[PDB]
Amino acid sequence: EVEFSHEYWMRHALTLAKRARDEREVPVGAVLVLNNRVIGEGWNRAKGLHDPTAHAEIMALRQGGLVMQNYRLIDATLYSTFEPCVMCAGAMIHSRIGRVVFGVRNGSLMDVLHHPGMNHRVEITEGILADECAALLCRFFRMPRRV
Amino acid sequence: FSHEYWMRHALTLAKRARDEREVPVGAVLVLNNRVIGEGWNRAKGLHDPTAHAEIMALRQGGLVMQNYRLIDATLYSTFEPCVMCAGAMIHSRIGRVVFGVRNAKTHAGSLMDVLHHPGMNHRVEITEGILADECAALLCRFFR
Ligand SMILES: [Zn+2]
Ligand SMILES: [Zn+2]
C-alpha cells in the first residue's frame, strides 16, 4: 500500500549505528526491509560478543532469517550506514536479497561485484544520507570529512 | 598433528551436516595443536544464511578464546570457503586456511583474490588439496 523513502530507513539505521558508537564499536547500523516492514536490525557488536562475524549487516540478516524461518531472504532490501565489507557482501549474496542501500563508501562491496562467487545479482544504491553517515565515522576515527 | 590429521576431524564434522541434509562441509579451527572451534554446515536448517561450517567454527573459536581476533589459528575446511567465509577469516586475523577440494564452479584464484590480496591489512595463508578426494566424495554423494 505505502512505501517509505530510502532516507527513512537510513535514518533508523543511523539510530542503530549510535548504539554501536556508545559501546566503542565501529559505528555502523543496518536494517533489513521486506514489504515496507522491518524484518531485521543490526549494529556492530564484534568486540563485545567475541564474534568476528557480528557486523551490523550480518546481525540484520540473521534476524531476517529468524523472522522468515528461511535462510533465503528474497526481494528484501538491506540498509547499511556504511559500505559493507567483503564478508557482509557475500552474506547478502547467499541471502539472495534484492537490494543493498548504503550511505558512505569505504575489502568492500564495490571490490567484489563480478567475483566468481556471485551467483545472484543484488542491486546497489549508494549515497543515502551520506553526510550523516560520514559524520559518525569521522567522529569515531577522528578524521576530516575528506576521508 | 599433520594437516591430514585435522582434515580427518573436519571430515567427521562434514558427515554431521550430511546427516542434517545440508551440503556436507565440516571445519575445525586449530590453535597450537588444540581444537578451539568446530563447525559444520547448517544454514538451511537453522534459517541463518551465515551458518556455514567455517563461520560456525570461527564463532565458537571467538567465544573459546574470548576474543574476536583468532591470531595464529589455522582453519581446516573440507570445502573451499565462499567469499563470506573468506571475509570472516580476514576479520578474525587467522594465520592459515587449509581446505580439501576446490569449488569447480566458482573458482578462477577467487579465494586468493580475497585472502591474499596485496593491498589488504591481513594476509591469510592458503593450503589446499588435503584429503581432497575424501572431501569430494562426501559432496558428490550429496549432489545427485
Ligand atoms: Zn561486514
Ligand atoms: Zn561460506
Residue numbers in the entry:
A (entry chain B): 3 to 108, 115 to 155
B (entry chain A): 6 to 113, 115 to 150
From the manuscript:
To confer the favorable attributes of ABEs upon a CBE, we envisioned transforming TadA into an enzyme capable of robust cytidine deamination and subsequently generated an improved class of CBEs that uses TadA instead of a naturally occurring cytidine deaminase. Here we describe the development of two families of base editors, CABE-Ts and CBE-Ts, which use variants of TadA to catalyze the deamination of cytosines with either retention (CABE-Ts) or loss (CBE-Ts) of adenine deamination. To illuminate how amino acid substitutions identified from directed evolution affect TADAC’s substrate tolerance, we determined crystal structures of TadA*8.20 from ABE8.20-m13, the template used to evolve CABE-T1, and TADAC-1 variants from CABE-T1 reported here. Through X-ray crystallography, we show how the accumulation of substitutions impacts the shape of the active site cavity and may contribute to the accommodation of cytosine as substrate and the subsequent shift in specificity toward C-to-U deamination.
